[PDB]
Amino acid sequence: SNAMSEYRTVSAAAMLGTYEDFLELFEKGYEDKESVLKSNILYDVLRNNNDEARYKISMFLINKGADIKSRTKEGTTLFFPLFQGGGNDITGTTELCKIFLEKGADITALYKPYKIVVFKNIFNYFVDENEMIPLYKLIFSQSGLQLLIKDKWGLTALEFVKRCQKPIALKMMEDYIKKYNLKE
């Protein structure tokens, strides 16, 4: 039993192992499946550096009814680890964002420790913006984005995007601000 020896909990398997490793733990581990599903296990999954594992395990848990609306003790939604780690699989990250939104997760909440929009990292992605459009559409279709709120150091989300090389994101943010009539 490779995975059963390597991982003591489903949480560990979810963050470090393959989809197959995670399955071994979910089924054969000592923890109660129902307790696992009600936990913030998806937060651990999203931190898996393995894109294929991250996606397959995420979809498995979501389909089994894992908690989508959970928050860390600091108030952080699933969107944060999704966007922090999702740069190498835009198709997968987009799909997961779509599903989180459909299932009621809140993308408007800030990441409190730094007072930043939860998707700030997507503007760091090394992928052509043409590829980012589906994800951009998902995000800007949500009411309540906090684009003009100063972060812990006095920088708003708009100000940040202005200084990246992301003209499409910039245009869409300006459009969002004009649509909703947002002010500084």
Next chain:
Amino acid sequence: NAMSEYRTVSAAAMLGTYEDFLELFEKGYEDKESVLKSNILYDVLRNNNDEARYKISMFLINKGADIKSRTKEGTTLFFPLFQGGGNDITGTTELCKIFLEKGADITALYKPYKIVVFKNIFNYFVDENEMIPLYKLIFSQSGLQLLIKDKWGLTALEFVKRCQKPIALKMMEDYIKKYNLKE
């Protein structure tokens, strides 16, 4: 009962609290000397709990962990330090300082991506003012490889130009000029 969570000190060091780690180390089954001789410090630097990362790292450093350790791919302790260090800039800076003082090599790339080992710090959300001490530690070292194309085709210099970190960029340009570095 940390052993219900972690079977090894390694697992505790990476996933658990300092207290969990201490229970595995002291009251676990593995031999302390074998653990101290392992590259467990590398695993600690991956711990998402910054309080635990700091406390456990200092514990191992003080007991003589090998600061010059290398993974099979030739990776130094600086890689997990910087990859995971953006939520605690103070502790990240302190650990970098200690690693340099104890002789770790900050010039080695992360070979699989051909990136400089501190590449991720330029993605940190903190204001550059808070990063000056770390920058000063890094740019005072001989032999930084700032003009090597990573697997995405970006040198360290080109990367810092993307989402602007103006202080890092100036300091890089200064460093390139100082050591007359070329592509």
